[PDB]
Structures are given as structure tokens and as C-alpha cells.
Design an enzyme around this catalytic site. Structure first.
Site, PDB file in Angstrom:
ATOM      1  CB  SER A 159      -0.951  -0.112   1.182  1.00  0.00           C
ATOM      2  OG  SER A 159      -2.056   0.728   0.898  1.00  0.00           O
ATOM      3  CG  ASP A 251      -6.805  -2.260  -3.529  1.00  0.00           C
ATOM      4  OD1 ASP A 251      -7.329  -1.193  -3.124  1.00  0.00           O
ATOM      5  OD2 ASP A 251      -5.623  -2.601  -3.258  1.00  0.00           O
ATOM      6  CG  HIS A 281      -5.744  -2.185   0.104  1.00  0.00           C
ATOM      7  ND1 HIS A 281      -4.985  -1.647  -0.920  1.00  0.00           N
ATOM      8  CD2 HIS A 281      -5.250  -1.665   1.256  1.00  0.00           C
ATOM      9  CE1 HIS A 281      -4.067  -0.837  -0.407  1.00  0.00           C
ATOM     10  NE2 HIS A 281      -4.198  -0.835   0.913  1.00  0.00           N
TER      11      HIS A 281
HETATM   12  C1  LIG Z   1      -8.242   0.683   7.719  1.00  0.00           C
HETATM   13  C2  LIG Z   1      -7.689   1.024   6.331  1.00  0.00           C
HETATM   14  C3  LIG Z   1      -6.389   0.233   6.196  1.00  0.00           C
HETATM   15  C4  LIG Z   1      -5.653   0.601   4.913  1.00  0.00           C
HETATM   16  C5  LIG Z   1      -4.242   0.944   5.315  1.00  0.00           C
HETATM   17  C6  LIG Z   1      -3.311   0.265   4.327  1.00  0.00           C
HETATM   18  O1  LIG Z   1      -3.449  -0.871   4.050  1.00  0.00           O
HETATM   19  O2  LIG Z   1      -2.297   1.019   3.781  1.00  0.00           O
HETATM   20  C7  LIG Z   1      -2.673   1.934   2.823  1.00  0.00           C
HETATM   21  C8  LIG Z   1      -1.662   2.701   2.406  1.00  0.00           C
HETATM   22  C9  LIG Z   1      -1.838   3.648   1.441  1.00  0.00           C
HETATM   23  C10 LIG Z   1      -3.079   3.813   0.887  1.00  0.00           C
HETATM   24  N1  LIG Z   1      -3.218   4.826  -0.126  1.00  0.00           N
HETATM   25  O3  LIG Z   1      -2.273   5.463  -0.426  1.00  0.00           O
HETATM   26  O4  LIG Z   1      -4.256   5.019  -0.620  1.00  0.00           O
HETATM   27  C11 LIG Z   1      -4.130   2.981   1.292  1.00  0.00           C
HETATM   28  C12 LIG Z   1      -3.912   2.021   2.274  1.00  0.00           C
END
Ligand SMILES: CCCCCC(=O)Oc1ccc([N+](=O)[O-])cc1
Length: 309
Positions: A159, A251, A281
Site C-alpha cells: 500500500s 481494491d 486490499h
Molecule cells: C483501515 C484502512 C487500512 C488501509 C491501510 C493500508 O493498508 O495502507 C494503505 C496505504 C496507502 C493507501 N493509499 O495510499 O491510498 C491505502 C492504504
């Protein structure tokens, strides 16, 4: 409707039953704690390993905490994995992704150094990138405190950590470290801006990562949409290292990963694109609650071994 695995579906229904406040409605400490608790209950337990040691290295803002994972007490020179956790650059830490790191170390039989990079909103963009880059360069220098010699480095992360993976590889491509990036593994990364993507609209609610959380992280981190360190789809792909891009079919930022892999093929770079079907995700850290995701992680591992030769 879109395909969802039965075990994935059961997890989604429990999340819906839990309900509760959004990240933005919580305090920051509560938001971070909720991530610790989710991965604590959802992921498989830590592997036993010969070495699990806390270290630190110098960085531009001060010392950067690190954690070394190795199945072996002593090993010869070889590539070192440099891991950056997910969490939007706002949440997560060395513990939220600890069990995953022990699994990567056990299954790869390579050392893993996780980076405890500075978080937003306290440290906005590009603080996380500064720390991930600095720590990766440090590992690449084979410092004595590491106890392992690196012949190359392998950036990996989920992520936001997959965003960092790509940025770090681009930064080291432009200004090399002491050894090359021999393989990068961005996992459900943010590469291009998800705003306006079809996947963001299709999976905006009910798929663990929500559009609301994406917006919460964005407000905190404040990445510039024109800066390739924020949106590395904008960077130069012509010398990208060998890459494995792993995405999830459910995702909201799936299409960002598709975009990046397409850009590497467009630039003639070697890439494995794996889109895990029927999972969300974050599948790398829910391997007990959704048992089929252990196999998704094992496919990434097999692709990594193949790409390393
Ligand atoms: C409770 C939500 C968990 C999602 C946190 C995760 O799994 O890390 C992420 C990192 C970056 C992004 N983004 O940039 O959109 C989304 C998610």
C-alpha cells in the site's frame, strides 16, 4: 456482482457487523490502535526466527528505527530485503506488519529489514520517503551493525509501502546506493492518483480500504500531485529494476497498480503482474482470518524467487 472468495466475504461481513467510527472520526491514536488490533486478530502468528533485532540508522531528521529479521544467525553476502509497511503514511508501525515480515524472512531465506519511517500528519510528505530511502541506502552499505553483507537490495512494501517501494527504486536508480536494487515488489501500491479511477468508485465502500480512508490519509500526508515522489507513475521507468506488482481485484486502488505495471511494459522493463482474484486490499496481513490469502502471499514469494534466479 464482483467475485469475492467465501472466506473473504465472511471477513467483510464481520467488518460490516463491527461498524464503528471512520478513521477521520477517531483520534489519531485511536486510528493507529485500530490498525494494530485488526492485524493482531486477522493475521497468522509470527514465525520463529534465529534473529529478530531492533536497530537504527541515521536519517535526515534523526535516527530511523529499524527491525532485522533473519532465519539464519549467520549468512553469506546476498540480497537484503528492505520492507516498508502500509498504512497510508499515517498509521502502521513495526508491529502491525511484524508477522508478515517474519513470514517473508522464513519463506525467502533472506534477511528482511523493516523501516519505522516517520508518519503524517505529524511529518507530512515526503518524510516517509526520506526515511525509507535513507534506511535502504544504509542497508545497501553493509554496515557492521547489520551483521549481513548486502550484494543488492530488494525494496518491498504494501500500500503506502508499495508507493515507497517504487519511489525508493526510482531514487536509487537516479543516484545509486552502494549496491543495486535487484528486484522491487510493490504490493497493492499507490502509483498513480486513484482519484477518478474506475476501481476507486467500484470499491469505495465495503472492501476494507474505503474511499473515506484514502481521503483521510491524503489530507494528512499532503503529497503533491505533480511530484514523482508522491505519485511515482510520473517518474522515469526506462531503467526500472525487475519488478513484481501484486494487486487485489477488489481494491479501490487496484487500477493504480495496473497503471504502473502497464507503464513498465510500455518502457520495456521485466515485470510480473499478479492480480489476486476475489480478495481485498491488505490481503498480506489477514492470513488467519481469510486463510486463502496465505496462498496469495506464497504466489508473490514464488514470483520473487523466480525473478531473483
Ligand atoms: C483501515 C484502512 C487500512 C488501509 C491501510 C493500508 O493498508 O495502507 C494503505 C496505504 C496507502 C493507501 N493509499 O495510499 O491510498 C491505502 C492504504
Amino acid at each position: 456482482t464482483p467475485f469475492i472468495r467465501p472466506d473473504m466475504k465472511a471477513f467483510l461481513e464481520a467488518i460490516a457487523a463491527m461498524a464503528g467510527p471512520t478513521l477521520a472520526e477517531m483520534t489519531l491514536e485511536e486510528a493507529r490502535a485500530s490498525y494494530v488490533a485488526l492485524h493482531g486478530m486477522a493475521d497468522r502468528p509470527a514465525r520463529e526466527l534465529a534473529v529478530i533485532r531492533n536497530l537504527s540508522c541515521p536519517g535526515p531528521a534523526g535516527d530511523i528505527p529499524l527491525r532485522l529479521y533473519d532465519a539464519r544467525e549467520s549468512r553469506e553476502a546476498g540480497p537484503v530485503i528492505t520492507f516498508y509497511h502500509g498504512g497510508g503514511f499515517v498509521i502502521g508501525d513495526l508491529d502491525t506488519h511484524h508477522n508478515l515480515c517474519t513470514e517473508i524472512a522464513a519463506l525467502m531465506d533472506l534477511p528482511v529489514v523493516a523501516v519505522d519511517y516517520r508518519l503524517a500528519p505529524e511529518h507530512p510528505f515526503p518524510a516517509a520517503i526520506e526515511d525509507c530511502e535513507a534506511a535502504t541506502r544504509w542497508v545497501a552499505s553493509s554496515p557492521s551493525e547489520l551483521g549481513r553483507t548486502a550484494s543488492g537490495v530488494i525494496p518491498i512494501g504494501d500500500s503506502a509501502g508499495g508507493n515507497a517501494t517504487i519511489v525508493v527504486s526510482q531514487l536509487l536508480g537516479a543516484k545509486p546506493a552502494d549496491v543495486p536494487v535487484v528486484l522491487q515488489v510493490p504490493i497493492f501500491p499507490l502509483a498513480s492518483d486513484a482519484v477518478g479511477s474506475a476501481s476507486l468508485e467500484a470499491f469505495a465502500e465495503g472492501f476494507v480500504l474505503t474511499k473515506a480512508s484514502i481521503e483521510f490519509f491524503d489530507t494528512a500526508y499532503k503529497a503533491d500531485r505533480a511530484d514523482p515522489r508522491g505519485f511515482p507513475i510520473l517518474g522515469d521507468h526506462t531503467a526500472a529494476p525487475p519488478t513484481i506488482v501484486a494487486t487485489a481485484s477488489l481494491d479501490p486502488i487496484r487500477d493504480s497498480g495496473r497503471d504502473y505495471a502497464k507503464a513498465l511494459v510500455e518502457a520495456g522493463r521485466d515485470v510480473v503482474y499478479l492480480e489476486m482474484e476475489g480478495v481485498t486490499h491488505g490481503f498480506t496481513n489477514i492470513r488467519a482470518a481469510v486463510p486463502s490469502t496465505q496462498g496469495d502471499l506464497e504466489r508473490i514469494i514464488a514470483a520473487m524467487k523466480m525473478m531473483l534466479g
